[PDB]
């Protein structure tokens, strides 16, 4: 009757398929949650091997066919983009919410009522988190940042070495700190150039008090160490001059060909002479440099680096005070290069790192910059350290920007579950079931942590819920709001005292994104799949 060239699913079938797909995506990454979680290996069809614990990377690398699974994968990607941490918790929470909402729907509860209940529960959870479970970081000091970094690097390849990696992360983030208009301290992460090089152990990873380039000097005749570096940043190639498309050379008097050919290279020669005449020592360009210009730099005893990355060049110019010049043209139609466009550094060296060389611009002036050189056993290990390091940097940035943190280890989830199951009795008649299911779904995080720890999940979560219920009922027991999970010993523990923190924005964004994804999937009750 429809005569539609495709398959159709309607009613319970499509809802069950969507929930099964979401649950499968959840179960894919449920084994990499919490410090007792374990990494996974992803192998391509060409033999490429990837070892990672990050949920977003795992979901990006996998091939996904079902649209709901695609929704969850893009939810994880969005959570990574907007926050940088919690990319697994958001997926798990969204899948659990979808499962509980589908169970409610199978109980003949209309999906609109469930959606309204989920919206109310999300709003009240955000409000309760912002009003009760936040901890101000002003009175905690640098220990708060250290603990946040250590918590973020748990369940990662650099977990046990956290005592050192957290110091590195905090130092780098504080080094790249700057202030903008209206006095907001902004921390531009991704300005920390993360360099990888296998070899010696992790503890030999170096935090550079400057910048690091993954490139070497163009010529072997140039010195590989300059003390008082006058860095000149350029955005144009230094090679033989060639006329543009609209300019053509036509010779009628043969005596002028030699002069033409000489001028052709003398133009670049005089440009290099103008650049060197101001005392420049290090010359970095995004374009290439041919042989004669390299020799010109060699004879002057000055560095010259070609094919420098644009972002690296911009960072070097910003840190050292230099300005990038795409051309040597002033405001009076001449070629010139003043000393004002020269950045300065305390030292520029080409260091050797495991049979390979890289350039270290050390201790730039007028601005502090940082870079990290990661040393690992092999390439996969270095990649995983880089991913974990980026996650830690993002967490520290979130903590420094917004000065509120919340206890970790499922304490927030248990407190929210207790508060929501108490609050659901206050409003509505059919939405109360939805809010109760939201509270129950919020408990998937501590349960997953306990399961990963191979502990008694039921008893441990029951004890956590009892502690939080006592905290919420007794007004003189507010100190129990911080009772999290001690995964090493499998017992409840005051996580705020133990130093297990995480940014409030992580939880807020995870809750909002998971609620929106569950709502989006829940509206679907009919599928049409046209044949290709």
């Amino acid at each position: 009757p429809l005569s539609v060239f495709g398959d159709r699913s309607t009613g319970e079938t499509i809802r069950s398929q969507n929930v099964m797909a979401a649950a499968s995506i959840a179960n894919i990454v449920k084994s990499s949650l919490g410090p007792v979680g374990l990494d996974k290996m992803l192998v391509d069809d060409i033999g490429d091997v990837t070892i990672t614990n990050d949920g977003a990377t795992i979901l990006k690398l996998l091939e996904v066919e079902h649209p709901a699974a695609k929704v969850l994968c893009e939810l994880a990607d969005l959570q990574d983009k907007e926050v940088g941490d919690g990319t697994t918790s958001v997926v798990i929470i969204a899948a659990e919410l979808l499962k509980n909402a589908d169970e409610l729907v199978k109980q003949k509860i209309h999906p609109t009522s469930v959606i309204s209940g989920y919206r109310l529960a999300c709003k009240e959870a955000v409000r309760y988190i912002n009003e009760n479970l936040i901890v101000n970081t002003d009175e905690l000091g640098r220990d708060c940042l250290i603990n946040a970094a250590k918590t973020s690097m748990s369940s990662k390849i650099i977990g046990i070495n956290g005592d050192f990696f957290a110091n590195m992360v905090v130092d780098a983030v504080l080094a790249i700190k700057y202030t903008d208009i209206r006095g907001q301290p902004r921390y531009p992460v991704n300005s920390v150039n993360i360099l990888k090089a296998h070899g010696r152990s992790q503890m030999e990873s170096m935090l550079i008090s400057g910048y690091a380039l993954n490139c070497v000097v163009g010529s072997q005749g140039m010195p590989k160490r300059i003390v008082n570096a006058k860095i000149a940043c350029l955005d144009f190639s230094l090679q033989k001059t060639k006329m543009k498309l609209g300019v053509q050379v036509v010779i009628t008097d043969p005596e002028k060909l030699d002069q033409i050919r000489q001028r052709e290279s003398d133009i670049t020669k005089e440009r290099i002479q103008k650049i060197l005449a101001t005392g420049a020592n290090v010359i970095l360009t995004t374009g290439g440099i041919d042989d004669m210009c390299l020799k010109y730099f060699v004879e002057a005893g000055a560095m010259a680096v070609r094919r420098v990355l644009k972002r690296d060049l911009k960072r070097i110019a910003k840190a050292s005070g230099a300005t990038i010049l795409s051309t040597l043209a002033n405001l009076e139609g001449e070629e010139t290069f003043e000393a004002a466009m020269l950045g300065q550094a305390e030292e520029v060296v080409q260091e050797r790192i495991c049979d390979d060389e890289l350039i270290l611009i050390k201790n730039t002036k007028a601005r502090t910059s940082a870079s990290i050189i990661l040393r690992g056993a092999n390439d996969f290990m270095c990649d995983e350290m880089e991913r974990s390091l980026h996650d830690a940097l993002c967490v520290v940035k979130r903590v420094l920007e917004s000065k509120s943190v919340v206890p970790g280890g499922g304490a927030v989830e248990a407190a929210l579950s207790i508060y929501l199951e108490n609050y659901a009795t206050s409003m509505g008649s059919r939405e109360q079931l939805a809010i109760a299911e939201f509270a129950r779904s919020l408990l998937v995080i501590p349960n997953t942590l306990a399961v990963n720890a191979a502990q008694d999940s039921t008893d441990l979560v029951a004890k956590l819920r009892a502690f939080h219920n006592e905290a919420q009922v007794n007004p003189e027991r507010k100190n129990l709001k911080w009772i999290g999970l001690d995964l090493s010993n499998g017992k409840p523990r005051d996580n705020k005292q133990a130093g297990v923190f995480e940014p409030t924005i992580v939880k807020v964004k995870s809750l909002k994104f998971a609620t929106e994804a569950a709502i989006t999937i829940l509206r679907i009750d009919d599928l049409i799949k046209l044949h290709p």
């Binding site: 700057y178 990888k196 910003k318």
Partner: protein, 172 residues
């Protein structure tokens, strides 16, 4: 035996589902037939879906060549591996004839196939290269032979360098 003006009328619109399914299957076989016919007769005289959608995809500005083989194939495979190590920008790959299901004449007398694709068209269809190349020539010989026709394209980091758009801003 009359009524030559059948005028099937509602039939085709009432059974259009099966007709369109058969049309889709026949067209799916049609792309494979068109792809395989570019080799047979055209040059012979003088999973398959993976090959099809690998040829369909990727940029037209990158030269991609494929090799058809059956189990001196080993020497040419080694030379191809050496060229791949020497030309990372190229995407050397090989596929069995039985997977493609080519003609028996190609299987019996055209085992060494050097098929080069550039933007969905055959810029080179070197087939049965035993006579004009040899049996044990090295990778450099194959590179020179292929570069003589202007088909093949013309430092080392530590391990890796690659990793919001706010690069760095010190402005107050």
């Amino acid at each position: 035996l009359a009524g030559e003006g059948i005028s099937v009328n509602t039939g085709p619109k009432g059974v259009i589902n099966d007709w369109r399914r058969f049309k889709q299957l026949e067209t799916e076989q049609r792309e494979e037939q068109c792809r395989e016919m570019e080799r047979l007769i055209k040059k012979l005289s003088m999973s398959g879906e993976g090959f099809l959608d690998m040829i369909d995809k990727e940029q037209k500005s990158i030269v991609i060549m494929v090799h058809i083989y059956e189990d001196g194939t080993e020497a040419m495979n080694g030379c191809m591996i050496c060229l791949a190590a020497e030309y990372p920008a190229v995407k050397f790959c090989k596929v069995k004839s039985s997977v493609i299901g080519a003609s028996s004449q190609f299987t019996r007398n055209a085992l060494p196939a050097l098929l080069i694709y550039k933007g969905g068209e055959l810029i080179g269809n070197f087939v049965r290269v035993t006579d004009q190349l040899g049996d044990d020539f090295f990778a450099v010989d194959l590179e020179a032979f292929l570069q003589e026709f202007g088909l093949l394209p013309e430092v080392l980091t530590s391990v890796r360098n690659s990793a919001s758009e706010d690069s760095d801003l010190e402005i107050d």
